[PDB]
Design a protein around this ligand. Sequence first.
Ligand SMILES: Nc1nc2c(Cc3cccnc3)c[nH]c2c(=O)[nH]1
Ligand SMILES: Nc1nc2c(Cc3cccnc3)c[nH]c2c(=O)[nH]1
Ligand SMILES: Nc1nc2c(Cc3cccnc3)c[nH]c2c(=O)[nH]1
Lengths: 268, 284, 280
Amino acid sequence: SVTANIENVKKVAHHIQKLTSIVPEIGIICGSGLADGVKDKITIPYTKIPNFPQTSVVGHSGNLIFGTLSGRKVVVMQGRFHMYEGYSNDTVALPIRVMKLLGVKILMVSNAAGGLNRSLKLGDFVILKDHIYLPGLGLNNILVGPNQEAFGTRFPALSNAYDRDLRKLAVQVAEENGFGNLVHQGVYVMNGGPCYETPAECTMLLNMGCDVVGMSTIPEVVIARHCGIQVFAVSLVTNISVLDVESAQRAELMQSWFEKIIEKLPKD
Amino acid sequence: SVTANIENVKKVAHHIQKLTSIVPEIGIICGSGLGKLADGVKDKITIPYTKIPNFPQTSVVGHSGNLIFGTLSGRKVVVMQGRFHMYEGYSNDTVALPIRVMKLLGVKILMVSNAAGGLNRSLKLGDFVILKDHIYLPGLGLNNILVGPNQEAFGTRFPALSNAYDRDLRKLAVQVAEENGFGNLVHQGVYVMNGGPCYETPAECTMLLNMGCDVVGMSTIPEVVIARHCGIQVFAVSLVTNISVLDVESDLKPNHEEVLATGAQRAELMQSWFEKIIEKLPKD
Amino acid sequence: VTANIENVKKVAHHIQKLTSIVPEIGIICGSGLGKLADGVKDKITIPYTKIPNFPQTSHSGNLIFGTLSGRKVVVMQGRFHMYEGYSNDTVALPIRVMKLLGVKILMVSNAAGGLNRSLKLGDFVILKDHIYLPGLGLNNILVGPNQEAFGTRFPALSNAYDRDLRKLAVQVAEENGFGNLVHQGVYVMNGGPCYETPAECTMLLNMGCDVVGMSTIPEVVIARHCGIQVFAVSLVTNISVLDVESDLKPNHEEVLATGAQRAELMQSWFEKIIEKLPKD
Ligand SMILES: Nc1nc2c(Cc3cccnc3)c[nH]c2c(=O)[nH]1
Ligand SMILES: Nc1nc2c(Cc3cccnc3)c[nH]c2c(=O)[nH]1
Ligand SMILES: Nc1nc2c(Cc3cccnc3)c[nH]c2c(=O)[nH]1
């Protein structure tokens, strides 16, 4: 890993700009579980980008996808970097800082999560309105280390981290497209991973006021807000958390939802 | 330290197999209270960690740890004498390797004891608390022993911990305690790991109790996580070596000498308990 | 360099060659103790940069020896915070150096957010206990081989915030007419460097925490480990926001400003405490 400072980020941004003329205004991290629908698209493999972080192979590398979507210029990250895999703070931060320099103003991110809130059902959508960053509370915050002042301040507040206006809009779109009944808003808590929670851990997290639980996202969100990118994030409830020791389907819908949100985003 | 990958683990397992012919089916990590257990082992061969290439090395005021093979209640066991605790600064790979070596040697069941403070207010000094679940605070916080590339030869990328403390082994242990006349000492509860090496402040204890924790210690969970990852069945018990202090105004305090002494007091009972459990384990 | 007896001895001896003051009280100036450094009489200033192997800061820090209310003190101007990326050994060494120099009591101030709903801006919250979130999570300053020359493998934190020093500090505030500003409570450490979200604040409050900050606990842990008595106060520089719907937010400039506002009061308070410390 190398440092996500202005110098290195500039270098990566410029290489990318030589491969495409698209200036992205919206960044999309897709998680669980569209990229096609993107029109006039060019695909850049991470492997073709000097110093861009590399992904988990098996046989297949990640891609950066530029193009348009609902008439908006977007860049899509296909292939994420998760802390449980062992990646450094700098590795996880760089792609987000590269988006900033490329022009990105809004980050949209989806993930899969377990449902703690007892009123949640399988397949529900839970818009993040706040989070609890357990690793960050415990000295593994993605921002630990010298601050890169070119991107943001030493002590960031996370006041309106999940932009309330984007949340309102997303609810409105779901409502008028007839699935407002699947959509909730709640608190996402990050478990460092890679283990699923024990029933005791789930019970503790619920009593902590958490609604859903996952292993991702918060580090990106922290980096995004740090450099002034607006954030929208949703969890797909892919399972109901088990609280007692004694104890691809929604993809099309989710894609359509993001597509219809982007179409209504206020454009400068 | 060497990565706990299949290559390195294989190498260590093979060296050990050259020093003994015992194929262990039960693995025992002696904590507080299992000091005497090591002795009762019959037909035993002792292998010092120092004689095992690439096996992690221990601390014990100079004296090295040992691996002890032999039989116990007619069952073939391997006993780890000397553990690796995270607060000592050991790596994830160091702590994981011994457990993965057991897997390749044939181990099917891991039995582990430890000492812990009593958070649940109904607990008494010297009580036995069988773990039925845990809260892995370091794991929640990105210091999970499994962080890093997954070793697929041993297990999956995203393990569930559904029945981590095998319910059948727990039921059996309760039965053995009951019929041998000490069922009144035995409880079941949730163990929470504090990374250590400090004892908890009263405020921390109060928080952990309200979190739903019954006992608190500094060990064990990492081994249990590695064991479950590679499909070994787990049985674990805490000896309550002290009552957690919840009030800043108190003058009671955790004393490591008193912790060691309680362990030594219940040691004979605990050894007998493990010995009688092993004797009733369903044998393939 | 490892904070072992050999390295600490080396640093202690170098310092002792630059000054004859044997300190009995150690002061870590946080938010509010800016002015305290000045009031120190007969003072010699030693810059960290002149001390071989002493940790380096992020203008350099200084070690200030001298007297204060007739007592011999050493003042650390410039701290080492974990969020900056410093090692356990780096944070621990200065405190271990104090031990060898003669320090018996550590006084520390910091700035914190107010979780307890009864707290007001500019209040003083004497620490009577703490919750060490990084410590619970395997990032305890003491992780690693134990340095036996300084203390035991498994330290208790029974009376970490000496009850007698707390009682005294309350008495001093009371008789000097600001007893109404002073509370006692539980301090929780957030590793940092981010301010807490409303959800995190809500969780921390329900955990039983009164104030939240990013410092102090590691030094306290090292101090208690080697048997130094500890006194620590938080200045409430902001009220924690518990609601996502609010438009109030933590502002570092307002944090700095509140600190500077109460600085004179805080200095006077530490000065009048030291004056009443039982002297061997
Ligand atoms: N911590 C946690 N994460 C998840 C996820 C996210 C995930 C996990 C593994 C593979 N792919 C995605 C889904 N459910 C949960 C959960 O319950 N807890
Ligand atoms: N955190 C915590 N740990 C323990 C232990 C574990 C132990 C092992 C060896 C020596 N000393 C302690 C026992 N009791 C406690 C406890 O109360 N809290
Ligand atoms: N975590 C947290 N810390 C603080 C502080 C301390 C501080 C020191 C340096 C810069 N900024 C803040 C003051 N208030 C808070 C807070 O609310 N939360």
